[PDB]
């Protein structure tokens, strides 16, 4: 009610994740691959 709005509990935390991916299905609004080599490489 209130205490949960003022504090956190030790050991209960969030972490961060990151990754690389490809997105397909665009209407010709993707990369100009002649200047982004990693796109074609991947």
């Amino acid at each position: 009610e209130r205490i949960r709005d003022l504090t956190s509990v030790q050991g209960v935390r969030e972490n961060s994740l990151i990754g690389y991916g490809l997105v397909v299905g665009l209407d010709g609004t993707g990369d100009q691959t002649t200047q982004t080599p990693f796109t074609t490489q991947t």
Binding site: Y20, G21, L22, Q41, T42
Partner: protein, 58 residues
């Protein structure tokens, strides 16, 4: 069944038994040199051709 295999990552070797190409390109070249020298000359002379009389004793 082989293990999990990524999709966009390059094919790198990851476990025992994987293959990998080596491009042998070695080119080493070392050298060194040194020298030293020294020289010395000397030449002295003196000659009384015609001695006057009053100096003949010397």
């Amino acid at each position: 069944n082989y293990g999990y295999q990524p999709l966009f990552e390059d094919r790198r070797p990851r476990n025992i038994g994987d293959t990998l190409t080596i491009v042998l390109q070695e080119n080493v070249s070392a050298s060194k040199s040194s020298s030293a020298n020294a020289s010395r000359d000397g030449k002295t002379s003196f000659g009384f051709d015609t001695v006057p009389r009053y100096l003949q004793g010397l």
